[PDB]
From a paper:
The rotating flagellar filament primarily functions as a propeller, acting as an Archimedean screw, and supercoiling of the filament is essential as rotations of a straight filament do not generate thrust. Here, we show the atomic cryo-electron microscopy structures for flagellar filaments from enterohemorrhagic Escherichia coli O157:H7, enteropathogenic E. coli O127:H6, Achromobacter, and Sinorhizobium meliloti, where the outer domains dimerize or tetramerize to form either a sheath or a screw-like surface. A shared feature in all four structures is the formation of symmetrical homodimers between the outer domains of flagellin subunits, with one outer domain rotated 180° relative to the other. These symmetrical dimers are the result of outer domains being able to adopt either an “up” or “down” conformation.
Since a seam breaks the helical symmetry in the EPEC O127:H6 flagellar filament, reconstruction was performed asymmetrically to 4.0 Å. However, the Bessel order of many of the layer lines must be different because the EPEC H6 outer domains cannot be reconstructed using the tetrameric flagella symmetry of Achromobacter. We have determined that this is a result of a seam. The EPEC H6 filament ODS is created by an outer domain tetramer with most flagellins being in one of four flagellin outer domain conformations, but the details of this tetramerization are quite different from those in Achromobacter. Due to the presence of the seam, most but not all D2 domains are in one of these four conformations. In one dimer conformation, “D2 Dimer A”, domain D2 of one subunit forms a dimer with D2 from another flagellin that is 11 subunits away. In the other conformation, “D2 Dimer B”, flagellins that are 6-subunits away (Sn:Sn + 6) form dimers with each other. While a large region of the ODS has very poor density, the resolution of another portion allows the creation of an ab initio atomic model of the complete flagellin structure.
Author numbering:
A (entry chain a): 53 to 499
B (entry chain b): 301 to 350
C (entry chain c): 103 to 151
D (entry chain e): 450 to 499
The structure:
C-alpha cells in the first residue's frame, strides 16, 4: 500500500507541474493581451482631443482596429498541447492526489474582442453636431389660433394625421404589464358574444379571460385550432383525478398509449376504458359534468360546466392571436390611468394620437412665437425651443446621436480590469499549485 | 382481493355505473373491491384474464 | 491536461498489460495443475493414517 | 474559373498525422517491450522455484 501511495503521489506531483506550465503559458498570453489593451487605451486618449483633422482620425481608427485584430489573433492561435486555453469559458482539472476526487480546477475565460466588448471601437464615427433651428416654414401642421394663454402673438400648430392604428394600440397595451382590455365577439371564446365584459385580466403574460356558459360546443374549435390537433387534459368528478385526451369533441381518448375511454354510468356519468354503454363525446360529457358538478380543467384553461354548457374560469389566449382577432372590431382597451375607445375602426373617438414612441391622448402641440421661433409652452421663460435635423419628427434636442463610442475610456478600463482579474486568478492558481507540489513532495518523502 | 389499483404508477380505480359496473379513476361511488366486482362481472359477463 | 492521443496510448498500454495478466493467469501451471484456473481446493496428506 | 493546385492543400495537418501514427507505433513497441520484460522476470522466478 505504501509503494502504491508513493507512486501515485509522485505522478500527481508531475501532473501538478504540468498544470504549473499551462498556467504560465496562459499568464504570458494574457500579459501580451494586456500590453495591446494599454496601447489601445493610450491611442484612444490621444485621439480624444478635438483639435485633430479627419485624416488623423482615420489613421488612429485604422491602427486601433489593427491592434484589436491582433488581439483577436493572439486569442485565436494561443494553444498548448492541442488545447486552446482562451477559446472557451471552460474548467480544467488537474489530478493532485493519489486517490479519486483530489483535483484542482482552473477557471478559464474565453477572451476576444467580442467578449471584452465594444465590438468595434469606432472612434472615427461622425461625432457631435449642432442641430438646425426650428425652421418655421417646414412645419405644415394643423393651424389653430385658439391661443389658450390669450397672447395675441402666439399661434398653435398641431401635427395631425397621427391617428394611431388598432395594431399600434394593441402593441401599446401589450407593452405594459397589468392592463385592462374589454372586448366582445372574440375568436373561439366569446364568439357567441353572450357576455360582453370579459376584461381578459391581463396579469403577467399572454392575455387571460373569464367567461360564463358560452363555449358549450366551442371546445373543438378553440382547443384544436388546426385540422388534426390533439390536446391533453385532466378530468375529475370530485376527489378522484383522471387523465384524458381530447380531439375535435369526439372520443375522449385516454392519456395512455392506446386506451380509449367510453361514457357510461347513467346517473353518475363516469369514465371507463372498458365501459358498457354508448360512445363518449364531448357534447354528452358536457351535460354529464353539468349534472354531476365535475371539472374538466386543463393546463391552458380551467373549465367546469353547470347544466349543458361549460363555465370558463382561467383561460389564456395567445397574445398575437388575440391581437389579430381584435384588429377590426369594437373594444375599449385601457392602459395605466387612461381609457381608449375603439368602435369598428382605429380611434373611433378620434382621441388617439401617436407621440414620439408612446401612445398619448393629446396631439403634439407646437406654438409659433412672434419672433418666428417654435416653443413647447406659451411662456417664453420655458419651452426649450424645438430644433430640426437628420431625423425629422421635430426633436427638442440640440444634439444628434454620434455613432462613435459613447464612453470609450470607461469601457477600456472595464476591459483592462477584466484582464487583470483573470491575471490575478491565474497567479493565485499558480501559487496554490506550487504549494501543493511542495506539500506533496514532503508527504511522499516522509511516507 | 382489496383495492383494484390501476396499473399506473399511483392511480387508484373506483367502480361506478350501477347497471354497467365500470372502472374509473374518477368514480362517484364507494371504494372498489374484488368481491363485488366478481358479481358485477358475473352479471355483465366480462373477462378479467391475466 | 492530456490530449486524446495520449489517452489512446495509455489505453493501449493498459490493455496490453491486462492481456499480460490474463496470459500469466492461464499459463502458470505446476505439474499438470493450473493453480490459478479454478476456485478449487488442494489436499496435502501430512498424517500417517 | 480556377485551376487545380499541385501544392499540398494542408501540409501541416497531414504531417502531424504522420507523427501521430509513428509515435503510436512506438508506443505499441514500448508496451510490447514492457510485457516481454515482465514475462522474462516471471519465467526466471518460476524456473528457479521449479
Amino acid at each position: 500500500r505504501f509503494t502504491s501511495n508513493i507512486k501515485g503521489l509522485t505522478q500527481a506531483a508531475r501532473n501538478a507541474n504540468d498544470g504549473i506550465s499551462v498556467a504560465q503559458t496562459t499568464e504570458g498570453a494574457l500579459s501580451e493581451i494586456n500590453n495591446n489593451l494599454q496601447r489601445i487605451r493610450e491611442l484612444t486618449v490621444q485621439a480624444s482631443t478635438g483639435t485633430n483633422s479627419d485624416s488623423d482620425l482615420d489613421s488612429i481608427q485604422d491602427e486601433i482596429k489593427s491592434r484589436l485584430d491582433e488581439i483577436d489573433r493572439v486569442s485565436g492561435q494561443t494553444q498548448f498541447n492541442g488545447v486552446n486555453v482562451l477559446a472557451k469559458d471552460g474548467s480544467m482539472k488537474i489530478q493532485v492526489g493519489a486517490n479519486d476526487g483530489q483535483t484542482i480546477t482552473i477557471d478559464l475565460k474565453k477572451i476576444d474582442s467580442d467578449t471584452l466588448g465594444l465590438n468595434g471601437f469606432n472612434v472615427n464615427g461622425k461625432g457631435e453636431t449642432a442641430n438646425t433651428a426650428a425652421t418655421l416654414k417646414d412645419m405644415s401642421g394643423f393651424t389653430a389660433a385658439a391661443a389658450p394663454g390669450g397672447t395675441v402673438g402666439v399661434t398653435q400648430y398641431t401635427d395631425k394625421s397621427a391617428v394611431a392604428s388598432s395594431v399600434d394600440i394593441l402593441n401599446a397595451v401589450a407593452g405594459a404589464d397589468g392592463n385592462k382590455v374589454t372586448t366582445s365577439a372574440d375568436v373561439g371564446f366569446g364568439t357567441p358574444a353572450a357576455a360582453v365584459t370579459y376584461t381578459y385580466n391581463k396579469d403577467t403574460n399572454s392575455y387571460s379571460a373569464a367567461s360564463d356558459d358560452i363555449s358549450s360546443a366551442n371546445l373543438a374549435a378553440f382547443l384544436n385550432p388546426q385540422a388534426r390537433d390533439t390536446t391533453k387534459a385532466t378530468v375529475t368528478i370530485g376527489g378522484k383525478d383522471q387523465d384524458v385526451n381530447i380531439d375535435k369533441s369526439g372520443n375522449l381518448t385516454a392519456a395512455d398509449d392506446g386506451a380509449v375511454l367510453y361514457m357510461d354510468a347513467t346517473g353518475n356519468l363516469t369514465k371507463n376504458n372498458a365501459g358498457g354503454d354508448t360512445q363518449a363525446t364531448l357534447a354528452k360529457v358536457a351535460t354529464a359534468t353539468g349534472a354531476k358538478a365535475a371539472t374538466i380543467q386543463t393546463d391552458k384553461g380551467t373549465f367546469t360546466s353547470d347544466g349543458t354548457a361549460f363555465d370558463g374560469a382561467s383561460m389564456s389566449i395567445d397574445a398575437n392571436t388575440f391581437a389579430n382577432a381584435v384588429k377590426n372590431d369594437t373594444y375599449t382597451a385601457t392602459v395605466g390611468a387612461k381609457t381608449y375607445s375603439v368602435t369598428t375602426g382605429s380611434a373611433a373617438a378620434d382621441t388617439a394620437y401617436m407621440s414620439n414612441g408612446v401612445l398619448s391622448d393629446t396631439p403634439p402641440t407646437y406654438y409659433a412665437q412672434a419672433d418666428g421661433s417654435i416653443t413647447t409652452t406659451e411662456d417664453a421663460a420655458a419651452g426649450k425651443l424645438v430644433y430640426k435635423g437628420s431625423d425629422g419628427k421635430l426633436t427638442t434636442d440640440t444634439t444628434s446621436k454620434a455613432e462613435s463610442t459613447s464612453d470609450p475610456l470607461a469601457a477600456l478600463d472595464d476591459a483592462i480590469s477584466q484582464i487583470d482579474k483573470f491575471r490575478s486568478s491565474l497567479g493565485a492558481v499558480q501559487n496554490r499549485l506550487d504549494s501543493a507540489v511542495t506539500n506533496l513532495n514532503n508527504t511522499t518523502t516522509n511516507l
